[PDB]
Amino acid sequence: MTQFDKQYNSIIKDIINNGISDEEFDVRTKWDSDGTPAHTLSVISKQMRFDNSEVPILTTKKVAWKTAIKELLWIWQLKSNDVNDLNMMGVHIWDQWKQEDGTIGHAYGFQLGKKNRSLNGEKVDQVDYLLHQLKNNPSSRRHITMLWNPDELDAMALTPCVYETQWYVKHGKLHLEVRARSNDMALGNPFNVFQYNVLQRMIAQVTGYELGEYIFNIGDCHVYTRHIDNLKIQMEREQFEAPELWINPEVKDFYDFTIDDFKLINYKHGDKLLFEVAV
Numbered sequence: 001m002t003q004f005d006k007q008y009n010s011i012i013k014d015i016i017n018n019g020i021s022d023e024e025f026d027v028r029t030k031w032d033s034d035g036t037p038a039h040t041l042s043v044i045s046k047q048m049r050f051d052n053s054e055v056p057i058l059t060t061k062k063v064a065w066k067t068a069i070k071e072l073l074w075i076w077q078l079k080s081n082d083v084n085d086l087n088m089m090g091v092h093i094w095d096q097w098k099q100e101d102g103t104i105g106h107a108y109g110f111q112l113g114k115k116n117r118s119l120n121g122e123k124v125d126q127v128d129y130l131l132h133q134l135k136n137n138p139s140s141r142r143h144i145t146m147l148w149n150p151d152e153l154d155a156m157a158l159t160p161c162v163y164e165t166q167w168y169v170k171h172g173k174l175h176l177e178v179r180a181r182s183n184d185m186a187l188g189n190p191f192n193v194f195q196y197n198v199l200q201r202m203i204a205q206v207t208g209y210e211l212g213e214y215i216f217n218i219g220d221c222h223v224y225t226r227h228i229d230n231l232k233i234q235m236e237r238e239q240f241e242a243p244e245l246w247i248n249p250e251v252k253d254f255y256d257f258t259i260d261d262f263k264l265i266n267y268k269h270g271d272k273l274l275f276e277v278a279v
């Protein structure tokens with residue numbers, strides 16, 4: 001029925017039938033409740049492609065799309081590592097890793113906000129630089145954002161899962177390729193695939209380019225053991241036509257966007273599904 005649902009279900013099926021278990025190893029993740037080792041079944045190097053003729057969102061279950069966009073704005077627009085700023089918006093998906101100072105360390109927003117790029121005699125951050133270059137230097141083969149700063153990896157509460165993106169301007173179309181080193185297919189993935197396609201749509205609007213291709217790459221593609229049952233259910237559910245994403249046409253500046261500027265139209269989906277989070 002939809003591009004995302006079809007690709008998503010297939011990858012999940014693959015992991016459940018040919019995934020490799022890590023039950024014999026001392027994994028880093030522990031279950032939220034009992035605190036016991038959280039293991040997974042996994043595969044490596046998986047890719048999802050979208051032509052952008054549809055909005056990449058799952059319909060086999062209820063996706064907290066509003067929360068996804070809020071997190072995106074927290075990282076890319078606000079460029080803050082303050083879990084508190086996020087709580088303000090009513091999101092607590094990052095509360096579990098909040099540090100003593102209320103932040104998640106020198107990660108995510110902190111990296112995108114660092115003024116380490118020389119533009120015109122002044123320093124700008126990765127986001128400002130990318131916005132300028134996409135307009136004044138489309139053909140560049142260096143349109144990259146990097147959350148994986150090797151120098152501050154030790155100062156991050158949790159190293160980024162979706163740590164990089166590369167943009168291509170070809171034929172007046174803006175293409176986006178993002179990569180996740182580690183992807184929790186049940187929880188994070190649905191959030192990641194959607195929130196980044198939204199970022200593509202935002203950047204495209206403020207730069208004046210048509211929508212290009214959208215590619216999502218995954219390194220370690222896994223599914224935690226306790227999620228199998230619900231996913232098996234989710235996969236058998238029916239799917240509905242993808243919804244339409246309305247973005248305020250008025251906004252011309254990237255930093256002018258607000259959660260209210262996004263509206264999902266006709267988003268039909270299955271019932272919500274609970275998935276325990278491994279910390």
Ligand SMILES: *C1=[C@](F)([C]N2[C]([C][N]C3=[C][C]=C(C(=O)[N][C]([C][C]C([O])=O)C([O])=O)[C]=[C]3)[C][N]C3=C2C(=O)[N]C([N])=N3)C(=O)[N]C(=O)N1[C]1[C][C]([O])[C]([C]OP([O])([O])=O)O1
Nearest residue numbers: 028064067093094161162182183184187188189275277278
């Ligand atoms: C990684 C990342 F970053 C993500 N993540 C984070 C946080 N976030 C989140 C959480 C949770 C959630 C939920 O819960 N969801 C829900 C909703 C409802 C409301 O509204 O609230 C449903 O149901 O949907 C969401 C989100 C941090 N951490 C983590 C995460 C996830 O996801 N998972 C976990 N387990 N944790 C991204 O971006 N992505 C991804 O996927 N990731 C992951 C991968 C893995 O698994 C992890 C990490 O680890 P390492 O070992 O690899 O490092 O994560």
